């Protein structure tokens, strides 16, 4: 038996935009979770329905490792029951979510003098996402009663927007890399 490929998830060179969040299915491996919790560079390590130091003593069918990049003051939205731009239109967790949310500042990697415009998020959406739903549609958002016909304009807005991370932004607008570990009923 081999270790779980958490290195490929946590230490990946590039993360995904939050609207197109990546998911890594983890199976057939052994994982030391309490070593992950003692990692000080993890600015956030919040678990729900389970204490972190108890994960090493439990087995589960599959573990899902979701990762993406958001801004600093959006990290609070990555939790069960949260509302707002990210939790409602980009990445939503169920209310009965069982797992841990891990985040750390990635200003040295995902910020760029002059702006890093590769990371995007959905700003306009008609209804909320279902938990663990990934919406990558780029259809023009209709804000009035007139149809847009795929053309931007008044009451017709492109749904995605770039973050434009700069190294000189405050921590609230600096990039943070997030890894959400969900446990489905690996030990």
């Amino acid at each position, epitope marked *: 038996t081999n270790l779980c490929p958490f290195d490929e998830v946590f230490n990946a060179t590039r993360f995904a935009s939050v609207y197109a969040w990546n998911r890594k299915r983890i199976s057939n491996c052994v994982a030391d979770y309490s070593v992950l919790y003692n990692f000080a560079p993890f600015f956030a390590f919040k678990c729900y329905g389970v204490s972190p130091t108890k994960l090493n003593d439990l087995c589960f069918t599959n573990v899902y490792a979701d990762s993406f990049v958001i801004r600093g*003051n959006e990290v609070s939205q990555i939790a069960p029951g949260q*509302t*707002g731009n990210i939790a*409602d*239109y980009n990445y939503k967790l169920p209310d009965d979510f069982t797992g841990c949310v891990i985040a750390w500042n990635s200003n040295k990697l995902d910020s760029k003098v002059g702006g890093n415009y590769n990371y995007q998020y959905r*700003l*306009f*959406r*008609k*209804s*909320n996402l279902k938990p663990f739903e990934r919406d990558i549609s780029t259809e023009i*958002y*209709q*804000a*009035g*009663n007139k149809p847009c016909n795929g053309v931007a304009g*008044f*009451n017709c*807005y492109f749904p995605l*927007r770039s*973050y*434009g991370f*700069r190294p*000189t*932004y*405050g921590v*609230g*607008h600096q990039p943070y890399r997030v890894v959400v570990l969900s446990f489905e009923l690996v030990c």
Partner: antibody, heavy 117, light 108 residues
Framework: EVQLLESGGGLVQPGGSLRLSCAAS????????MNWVRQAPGKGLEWVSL???????FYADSVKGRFTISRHDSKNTLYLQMNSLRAEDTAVYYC???????????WGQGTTVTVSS | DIQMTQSPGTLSLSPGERATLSCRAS???????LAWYQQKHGQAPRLLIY???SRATGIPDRFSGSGSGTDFTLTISGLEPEDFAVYYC????????FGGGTKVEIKR
């Protein structure tokens, strides 16, 4: 003309209730970020409440637990339910469509709320 | 919490002069998340500029904005009579937040 037509303002005694309305024409309330922004006499604008097109609501700390923002899709109208009104709630209340990155482009004419005995 | 401070509280200039209005944020925020508004006395506010520097639909050429991080600026190149009003900047966090506002009056 794209407008936001407001009504419902009036005289409320301290501790009383009042419901403001904001009838849109030229945009769909159901499909937009919508704000309520008030302005006490002689003072600046204060954001009060926000509702997402998806249903999520947000409130300023000064109105938490007392105000409630809502809408009726069939009437294309935004609402602000105000309970336990205090004297400092006296202001001119505006509704506005919010495009966030494009600013609040459409503004209501305002409706006046006066809290007095 | 973030805070938006506008200075000066009152700006006294003559028609045709160059107006510079400061809006300071307590935290370094992206330029796409800042807007300016105008409000004449007795009237509702109107959107002047969105995303720090983009001029709103119908806003005359003389209005311009710039800045980044914590310091933002609204510039009026040549004040007209209708331009003497109160101007508010507004930042987008988890919710909108307005500055205190700056009144531009006529100097005589």
């Amino acid at each position: 003309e794209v407008q936001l037509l407001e009504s419902g303002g009036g005289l409320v005694q301290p501790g009383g209730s009042l419901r403001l309305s904001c009838a849109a024409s030229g945009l769909t309330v159901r499909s937009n970020y919508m704000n309520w922004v008030r302005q006490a006499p002689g003072k600046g604008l204060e954001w009060v409440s926000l509702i997402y097109s998806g249903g999520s609501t947000f409130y300023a700390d000064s109105v938490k637990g007392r105000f409630t923002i809502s809408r009726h899709d069939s009437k294309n109208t935004l609402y602000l339910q105000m309970n336990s009104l205090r004297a400092e709630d006296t202001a001119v209340y505006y509704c506005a469509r919010d495009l966030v990155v494009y600013g609040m482009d459409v503004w209501g004419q305002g409706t006046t709320v006066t809290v007095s005995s | 919490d973030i805070q938006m401070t506008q200075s000066p509280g009152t700006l006294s200039l003559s028609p045709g002069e160059r107006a510079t209005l400061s809006c300071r944020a307590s935290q370094s925020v992206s330029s796409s998340s800042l807007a300016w508004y105008q409000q004449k006395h007795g009237q509702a506010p109107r959107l002047l500029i969105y995303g720090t520097s983009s001029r709103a639909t119908g806003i005359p050429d003389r209005f311009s904005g710039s800045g980044s991080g914590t310091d933002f600026t609204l510039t009026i190149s040549g004040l007209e009579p209708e331009d003497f009003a109160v101007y508010y900047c507004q930042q987008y966090g988890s919710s909108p937040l307005f500055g205190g506002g700056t009144k531009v009056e006529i100097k005589r």
